Design a protein around this ligand. Structure first.
Ligand SMILES: NCCNS(=O)(=O)c1ccc(Cl)c2ccncc12
Ligand SMILES: NCCNS(=O)(=O)c1ccc(Cl)c2ccncc12
Ligand SMILES: [Ca+2]
Ligand SMILES: [Ca+2]
Lengths: 261, 263
């Protein structure tokens, strides 16, 4: 059945719609109700205790209550190997949508800068998870060995500098940079930030959130900017807003790290 | 070491730009390979699915058998590599049916196309068909999928208006109410995203892992389900059976639509 009798009873009066598998390997179901939407997010036991495990996402959502705008945890359970999280819908409009037609590079970059600022204001002394590079790399070793890592187009392309996934891993292992831990979203992108009245209104997709180096989220922003918006001058703009000098070695490193995840 | 595809295959596709497909064929992974003279498609399924109608090896076998019988993609390369089954194939010919009806307001042309498919399938000589997807076969495979939590458990098992407490009860029902069967060639997952059209006539089929011998009401039932949830009006269902020249056996139609839920 995958969900418990209790959870089924909770979600009964909602119309269930499978999401487009945007959060694969997690299964996401939109639950359309009369007065609101709920989201049910599920991950199987192969992902237990990794940064994909929604139990992990649930823990961070509870800890983040009162520190960052996040959906409310409504129900959580382990059932028949599955981790099942039922949550409220984020407030505001999804970034990718808010700026869908907005050819405004300036606004998403401004939004990225605000997120980084918000993150650095969060006290991580009691943060439930530490996603230091030793932890991420141990996890990556495990995913690789159990054929759960995300091997695809970026390992097969002729243009790849590494002959295979394990070559990229060894590089990540030996070139590990020094780290200064701060709160980190883990997968910061326009598909999981919500905005409302020009202000950040919510974050979702928090399974990879916790302590990590400050250049990790920054690196993701640089990658977003370059992928969408095409011009490198918007990268320089991003760093003027942050008011810091980019560390390209670290930025390159974190972008490579995400390839297998 | 953990490439998923062999060096031979990596090499074959080197000159192509790789792009992940919509993921509408889960649990298969599909990659569109954009080149200068054509596009290829790489479709991969993992070892949990070996032996089942999800395994692309079975789809490859059917595609080789169908060459010259139905318009289908060409098998460019197939391999087993590290538990994976990998199939490289050409692009279908024509326009995807759900895109020709994109905005044409031609509901009857969809109905005509479905009826054409059914007639085409009935004309296929299956004397040497590699697979027999009889109800015994499908139910044995469904048993295995449920035992390993590989069945498609989702909304349909969770809704308030579900007639079955759990997936097993559905299975025992399907096993108990097994209708009699008249085998003909069957696509196995006939739908608007699987049928290509060129010049008002069918021009290609994809998604063939579930194809082989099955009862004639199987594909017909999928058409009725498609017509109702895509078009809506019941007059197009009556038109469908009129074009087929047969009266609908609703007990069998409902049976096969039910069968597909866990898949
Ligand atoms: N990028 C998410 C697209 N759909 S969404 O924004 O409504 C959405 C998708 C998935 C989950 Cl788990 C959510 C949770 C809370 N709010 C919106 C959620
Ligand atoms: N619903 C399928 C639409 N995308 S498609 O028609 O281009 C397509 C998708 C997936 C595969 Cl494997 C294909 C193979 C051959 N031709 C088109 C193929
Ligand atoms: Ca990847
Ligand atoms: Ca189902």
């Amino acid at each position: 059945m995958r969900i418990s009798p209790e959870l089924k009873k909770l979600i009964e009066k909602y119309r269930c719609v499978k999401d487009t598998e945007g959060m694969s390997p997690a299964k996401v179901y939109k639950l359309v109700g009369e007065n609101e939407n709920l989201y049910l997010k599920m991950t199987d036991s192969r992902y237990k205790g990794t940064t994909y495990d929604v139990e992990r996402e649930k823990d961070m959502m509870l800890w983040l209550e009162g520190k960052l705008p996040v959906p409310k945890v409504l129900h959580f359970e382990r059932h028949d190997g599955w981790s099942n999280l039922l949550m409220s819908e984020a407030d505001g409009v999804l970034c990718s949508e808010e700026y869908e037609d907005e050819q405004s590079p300036e606004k998403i970059i401004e939004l990225y800068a605000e997120c980084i600022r918000l993150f650095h204001s969060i006290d991580i002394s009691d943060c439930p998870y530490t996603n230091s590079l030793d932890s991420r790399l141990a996890e990556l070793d495990y995913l690789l060995n159990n054929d759960l890592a995300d091997v695809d187009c970026e390992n097969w392309e002729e243009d790849t500098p590494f002959k295979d996934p394990r070559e990229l891993y060894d590089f990540l292992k030996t070139e590990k940079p020094e780290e200064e831990l701060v709160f980190s979203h883990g997968d910061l992108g326009d598909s999981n930030i919500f905005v409302k009245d020009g202000k950040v209104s919510g974050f979702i997709d928090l399974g990879r959130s916790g302590r990590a180096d400050k250049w990790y989220d920054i690196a993701f922003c640089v990658r977003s900017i370059r992928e969408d918006i095409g011009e490198e001058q918007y990268v320089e703009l991003f760093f003027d807003l942050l008011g810091i000098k980019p560390d390209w070695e670290k930025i390159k490193y974190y972008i490579l790290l995400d390839e297998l995840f």
